[PDB]
């Protein structure tokens with residue numbers, strides 16, 4: 490709740506379990522990590538007045554997903570933009586000081602209506618925290634590329650589990 | 657509409673643009689490809705009586721996403737199970753004989769309520785075609801692992817575009 494911005498090294502540290510500690514929220518490591526930095530995170534503001542994040546991913550033509558999605562027709566997979574949003578919501582829960590490891594629970598409505606091409610420079614994520622409570626967060630999110638809105642998700646859900654070995 | 661099952665080599669061929677031809681639907685290539693084989697595909701049956709697919713992905717502990725999602729806590733990303741479903745719906749549109757390249761358009765409701773661990777053997781996807789029409793398909797889908805249902809998506813949408821360079 491005190492630190493409001495995070496560098497890539499912070500996010501890598503988070504992915505090793507070294508930002509929030511043992512048994513607590515982890516971002517994925519590369520190549521599933523879809524965030525380069527969190528430019529702003531707060532527990533106030535956002536469209537519901539219950540917090541928001543602004544985060545970024547730098548684009549260059551050599552990002553691994555362009556070569557295979559699709560051959561001769563490169564475009565960032567929307568599923569990874571969507572996962573960026575789940576990653577960010579999980580991070581928020583950890584940043585709030587909740588214990589447990591993250592699992593995406595799903596989403597209300599997801600829309601893709603624009604492309605991230607390999608000539609793009611920067612993707613920006615906006616996350617609006619709708620509600621926090623098991624421990625879980627509900628949020629809305631939008632992905633943009635170089636100023637243009639391209640993806641949206643309503644009712645993103647992420648949960649924290651102190652146990653996942655007894656299902 | 658004539659061939660009702662596809663091997664991994666067929667799906668790799670599809671990813672190179674060589675199953676449906678130039679400017680037509682492509683599956684992603686590895687490592688975004690989340691399908692090993694399509695066990696059954698039909699334009700009849702399914703929960704709406706407008707077609708269905710059954711597909712599989714073999715699991716082993718060395719699949720790339722286990723190491724990074726998450727370090728010390730491996731679990732298949734739900735976003736990739738979800739993408740498997742979009743991949744399959746796009747494939748269906750191509751299999752039906754529609755021209756154009758695929759783009760996921762989004763989804764109605766997504767739920768994750770179970771894990772694919774690295775000790776699992778086989779993930780099975782079921783897709784139920786709800787409606788086909790731009791060219792697009794609406795469908796519902798469920799992901800299962802070794803018999804157990806774990807993810808669901810309502811109102812998966814995928815579209816085909818004969819042009820994506822003029823947005």
Ligand SMILES: OCc1cc(-c2cccs2)on1
Pocket residue numbers: 564565566567568601602603604605758759760761
């Ligand atoms: O596969 C994800 C994806 C989908 C799209 C578009 C959807 C509609 C117009 S472009 O851009 N990226």
Ligand SMILES: OCc1cc(-c2cccs2)on1
Pocket residue numbers: 591592593594731732733734735768769770771772
């Ligand atoms: O990060 C995605 C994911 C989430 C889950 C679970 C959700 C609820 C219980 S386990 O499995 N994979």
